[PDB]
Amino acid sequence: MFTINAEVRKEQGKGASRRLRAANKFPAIIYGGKEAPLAIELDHDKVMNMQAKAEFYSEVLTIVVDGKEIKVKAQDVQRHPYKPKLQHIDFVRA
Amino acid sequence: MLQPKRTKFRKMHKGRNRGLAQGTDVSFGSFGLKAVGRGRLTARQIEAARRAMTRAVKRQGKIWIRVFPDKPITEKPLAVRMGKGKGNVEYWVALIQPGKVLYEMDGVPEELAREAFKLAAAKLPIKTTFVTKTVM
Amino acid sequence: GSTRNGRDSEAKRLGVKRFGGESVLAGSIIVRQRGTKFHAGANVGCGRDHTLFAKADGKVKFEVKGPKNRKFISIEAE
RNA sequence: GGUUCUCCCCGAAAGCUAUUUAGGUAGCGCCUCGUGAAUUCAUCUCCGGGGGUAGAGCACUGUUUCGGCAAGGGGGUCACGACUUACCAACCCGAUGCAAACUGCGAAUACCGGAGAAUGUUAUCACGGGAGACACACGGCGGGUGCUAACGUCCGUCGUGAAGAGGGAAACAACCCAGACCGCCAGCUAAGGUCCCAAAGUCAUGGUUAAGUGGGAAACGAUGUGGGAAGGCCCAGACAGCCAGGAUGUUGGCUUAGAAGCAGCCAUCAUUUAAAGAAAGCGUAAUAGCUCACUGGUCGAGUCGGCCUGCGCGGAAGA
RNA sequence: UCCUCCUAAAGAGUAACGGAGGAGCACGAAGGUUGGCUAAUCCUGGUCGGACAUCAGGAGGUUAGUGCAAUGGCAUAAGCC
RNA sequence: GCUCAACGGAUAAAAGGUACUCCGGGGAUAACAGGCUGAUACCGCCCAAGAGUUCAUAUCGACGGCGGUGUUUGGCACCUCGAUGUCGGCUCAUCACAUCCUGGGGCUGAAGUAGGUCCCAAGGGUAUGGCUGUUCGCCAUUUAAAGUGGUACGCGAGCUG
RNA sequence: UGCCUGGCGGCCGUAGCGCGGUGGUCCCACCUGACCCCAUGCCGAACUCAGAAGUGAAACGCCGUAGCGCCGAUGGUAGUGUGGGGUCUCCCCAUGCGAGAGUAGGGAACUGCCAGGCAA
């Protein structure tokens, strides 16, 4: 019952991901199965308010991208080391 | 005064304090005291911020100190010219990058652990913040 | 006061002199090194100072052989 | 110390090595002049390379904290032997940091070499004539040292000064822009600027600031103020006022002097009930004592406490 | 004066009254070659015999050794005979 | 055949004094003063353990933290070695304020009188003697008080020595 | 050609261990005997020789298994070349390169020359 509206990243790198992170957004990625890993771009203040709930980190999520529905869990997440925010989340496509 | 036991070499270089930290996540405890500023803590400052922090949580509970000094600081005496060797070691500092969880705590409620790290952080030369053990 | 250090030595000028594909006339020192950091391979001799000297006016080429992966120095023949 | 006319072209060095040498000199590096030579050399792209620094990691060398298992160790207890055993704790395992003299990993650049195109007054090398110079300065980056002090000191590398005027930084070798053949009462720009001194926007739009901030400074403090993300409690009635209750047996224990709602220990009760915590602080010698909490009445619409960020305030005293 | 490491910024080089240590030799075998061999330290069992001698087996893997400081090297051993 | 180890070795062969000193140079290099710095010294804050019959914050503030000042002791060697005369006393001062007195306040573990601590304020005021070369210090006796510092540790083309 | 096996390599842990199974007519290993060739700082244990009764136990080869070692992306983070900037013991922006660790995952090597056996 956790729905996260996301987008597809079109530029990626150091400079692309710091420009993206100063716009109250951050990058993510969905990977797993046998298919291509899809680079996922999604808004920060939503997912930062999602992850306080402890069933974010255990139960199956649905990332909405391109109109599709993709059922993921959350595998690995990078905090910002002295600010209460995020940089990147690893979602296993499952 | 936390001090290393039988070090390799007595005197080491100055070195720069660049980069981010490693003790970012709260591992051993439930509540931590994370650094935001880039400074360095002496062994008298770790131990003074521990006495001001053990006291508020009257001793039951458990406290983990995630920093140890292991870096000697030399000091030239007064009325001594430059040169004629490196100074002699007086005290021992730990280098703190931003993000370093300094202390941790477990076994006390969330507000007493809140109101003990602030009494500890008034003894530190770096600007710290309060963090809680996060899932994953 | 006083000091007890301040002593070192003439830097020995070690390392590799001739690199990769770079034609060396026979007898040309390639690597001047302490021990056998780089081992002698095809057409390349090893001296009494572990200086791998060339032995055939050709190229160079470093490699990794056996089951120890020791950079090895051979000589392509051109 | 001083070294006397003019013009033109190029134009350094304050480095290494050695020196009874350190303010001197000699060879080399850099300079100049002459001669002779190879797409010689430089940039770039492409290719072959070697690393072991930045980072990272903790298998090794050392350091380091935590828990588990735990030899041993330690305390105290026994009759040649051991019993009870508040404690110290190696090897391993799981988690955690650190290192110039740590590395099972590892960049960027830099360097050597090869191919190729463009470009550059051969810029390259070798030899011969002549030198000077071997006191460097600051700035950026990488460090040592010192106080992560100094317009300090000592190397690395780049720039400027030296030996470089001009515009800018109020003035300000060494900073920013830019390299003065000569002349002109011509135009375009750079850094920096456009209210007056003082050339050019009292330009247009959109926010912020109340501090003369701008136009010095920190830990720390605070209903200053603007934007954001979430919550709690709310027109089945909150928040601050305004009227009632704000207690019953608990002198409850405690070493048996007293702690007694509000002492050390504590558990942190349960009835009476719209409401009372065996109490948050004010009373105390211990009680007595005012008191809000927790409940309605009233009241009439939002209120409170955190967080992330913009700019301000205090902290702020010199002849 | 000489050698080793770091500073030394992954080619070489690089300073300070910078941080650490060493040399002013030894050897006629400790050199040459051919032929073989494999350490350290714990563990159990065992006469005197113990924490530790020699013997045996196992674990272990080069944590050993290298005429002598440090670094690099060393199983094809440069280590041992 | 040389610890010619001052190891590119000046000779086979070599130590000291100079306040009796002299010459050539140097601010390339010390003493004084200035600059830069602020380790130190000094002043102010921050946290609040404890003391104060109870009560941290009347007063004091440990363990530690953050600053200011340019007054200490120092660091550096930038100006000066073809000369910037020095310690203390005298004479005359001058500014700052971190105020000793006088003046106005807050708090007090302040009844009064007298304090303590703190904020505001620089108008004027701010001892004489004994000893010592002394500044300091100690002492005697006063005073409303006997302030702390900058000024080449003010002041020798003004004096002293 | 297809399996088994032995020598010599290519490569060098995706190839190494652990654990479970498996093979003897061939080959291989132990094994048998040693007076001799040779051999032990004692010992045929090893080395060496002469043979072939026994077993596949050990070891070796093969098979199966991920319990460890090892391989390992994409994304992000760190670092940094060049050019600007700042509240400048540290960082930021434009651009170029871009790890290490960790994650998904892969994975119980593959392969050449010759010879022997056995089936075709």
Task: From B4, B23, B114, select the one nearest B66 (Cα to Cα).
Answer: B23
**Could you check: is the Cβ of residue C61 within 7 Å of any atom of nucleic acid strand D?**
yes
- Overall number of domains in chain A: 1
Total residues found in chain C within this entry? 78
B10: in domain: no
- Cβ-Cβ contacts under 8 Å between B and C: the total is 6
Instruction: Give backbone dihedrals phi and psi of B47, rounded to 5 degrees, phi first.
Output: -80, -25
**Are the Cβ atoms of B36 and A79 closer than 8 angstroms?**
no
Structural domain that includes position A42? 1-94
B1: in domain: no
Q: What is the CATH number of the domain that holds B115?
A: 3.90.1170.10
CA-based nearest distance C12→chain B, Å = 25
Residues 8-67 of C with CB under 7 A from strand E: 8-16, 33-37, 39, 50, 66
Q: Which nucleotides of E are covered by protein (CB under 7 A)?
A: 2-8, 11-22, 71-74, 76, 78
DSSP code at position A60: P
| Range 59-98 of B in CB contact (< 8 A) with A | 98
**Could you check: is the Cβ of residue B81 within 7 Å of any atom of nucleic acid strand E?**
no
- Overall number of domains in chain B: 1
C partners (3+ CB pairs within 8 A) are B
Q: Give the C-alpha distances (Å, rounded to integers) separating A41 from A11, A18, A76, B49.
A: 10, 13, 16, 42
Q: Where are the beta strands (DSSP E) in chain A?
A: 3-8, 25-31, 38-43, 61-65, 68-72, 76-80, 83-92
Residue with tokens 């298919």: A35
Query: Which residue among A74, A76, A81 places its CB closest to the CB of B21?
Result: A81
Q: How far apart are CA C28 and CA C53, in angstroms?
A: 5
Which CA-bearing residue is nearest the C1' of F64? B123
Q: What is the CATH number of the domain that holds A94?
A: 2.40.240.10
- CB-facing half-sphere around the CA of B14: CA atoms within 13 A: 4
B5: in domain: no
Q: How far apart are CA C29 and CA A69, in angstroms?
A: 66
- Cβ-Cβ contacts under 8 Å between A and B: the total is 21
Q: How far apart are CA A54 and CA C77, in angstroms?
A: 68
B74: in domain: yes
Query: Which residue among B24, B34, B135 places its CB closest to the CB of A54?
Result: B135
Contacts of B32 (CB under 8 A, 6+ apart): B26, B66, B101, B102, B103, B104, B105, B130, B131, B132, B133
Task: From C25, A6, A83, C39, select the one nearest B24 (Cα to Cα).
Answer: A83
Contacts of B61 (CB under 8 A, 6+ apart): B105, B106, B107, B108
Using a CB–CB cutoff of 8 Å, tell me whether B129 touches chain A: yes
Q: How far apart are CA B8 and CA A48, in angstroms?
A: 46
Experimental technique, in short, is cryo-EM
B13: in domain: no
B6: in domain: no
F130 C1' to B60 CA distance, Å? 69
Structural domain that includes position B88? 21-136
D159 C1' to C6 CA distance, Å? 33
Task: From A90, A86, A65, A73, select the one nearest A20 (Cα to Cα).
Answer: A86
Q: How far apart are CA C40 and CA B60, in angstroms?
A: 67
